[PDB]
Design a protein around this ligand. Structure first.
Ligand SMILES: COc1ccc(Oc2cc(NCCC(F)(F)F)c3ncc(-c4ccc(C(=O)NC5CC5)c(C)c4)n3n2)c(F)c1F
Length: 257
């Protein structure tokens, strides 16, 4: 089944994500190369939705320069009815590559963490706060992770409120610190193999736990202390307390050997 984007033509290998009025497809060009293509349908001109999407393209466009830990965008076409974005295709998302795994190599867990921070630092410099980070939002492309999205649009899910931080639940304000927390949970889950409450099931309880000063988060012993320190510093409950992405970038855990 064909597709046209700026008069270049694309044959769909398959759908790889869906949500709202948009679908993502793995696809091939004329010269047998792979790409993802996000196709959004504007027939439902929910006007908040529509500006959310014009805003995502705008940013995705601007962050092409400042980092390649950010998914590449080769082209797009937008009209009143549709939006096609032709992007990079990753081998695999992170959320998967983790569930098909028992032991993560410590060196990889570090290199993925670096990549994580770099990408999140990049979007903070441009004043974006994701506030929705989870493993799905990252993506493997030749050893490097790359952030796929910014939290601008009511995002797809491939084909969970573990990573929800405290401030987002009491506040019913969002700073950068909010992404740190979710990053911690993602690192947490990469060391221990469960987010910090994959084991509470009562949702009313789970969010009382996320916000209960007197619930001591269980921090096991591990081969490397630095990691353990990074993890405690990220999963603090006062944002004013919590470590920053710039402090995180100058941490021993990311800098030494
Ligand atoms: C939360 O929304 C998601 C939706 C779909 C997702 O899955 C995937 C899986 C991929 N692996 C492809 C390899 C395969 F399966 F074909 F073998 C892949 N490659 C490029 C993109 C991709 C690219 C761009 C965007 C995107 O729209 N980002 C916004 C424009 C900023 C999305 C959601 C996924 N994806 N996306 C995902 F991980 C999400 F987090």
């Amino acid at each position: 089944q064909s597709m046209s984007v700026k008069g270049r033509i694309y044959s769909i290998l398959k759908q790889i994500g869906s949500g709202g009025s948009s679908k993502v497809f793995q696809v091939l060009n004329e010269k047998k190369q792979i790409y993802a293509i996000k196709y959004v349908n504007l027939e439902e001109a929910d006007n908040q939705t529509l500006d959310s999407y014009r805003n995502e393209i705008a940013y995705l466009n601007k962050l092409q320069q400042h980092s390649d830990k950010i998914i590449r965008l080769y082209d797009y076409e937008i009209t009143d009815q549709y939006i096609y974005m032709v992007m990079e295709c990753g081998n695999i998302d992170l959320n998967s590559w983790l569930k098909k795994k028992k032991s993560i190599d410590p060196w990889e867990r570090k290199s993925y963490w670096k990549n994580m921070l770099e990408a999140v630092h990049t979007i903070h410099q441009h004043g974006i706060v994701h506030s929705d980070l989870k493993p799905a939002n990252f993506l493997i492309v030749d050893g490097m992770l790359k952030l796929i999205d910014f939290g601008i649009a009511n995002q797809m899910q491939p084909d969970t409120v573990n990573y929800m931080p405290p401030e987002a639940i009491k506040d019913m304000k969002i700073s950068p610190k909010s992404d740190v927390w979710s990053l911690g949970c993602i690192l947490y889950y990469m060391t221990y193999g469960k987010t910090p409450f994959q084991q509470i099931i009562n949702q009313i309880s789970k969010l009382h736990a996320i916000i209960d000063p007197n619930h001591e988060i269980e921090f096991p012993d591990i081969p490397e202390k630095d990691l353990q320190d990074v993890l405690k510093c990220c999963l603090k409950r006062d944002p004013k307390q919590r470590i920053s992405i710039p402090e995180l970038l100058a941490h021993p855990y990311v800098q030494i050997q």
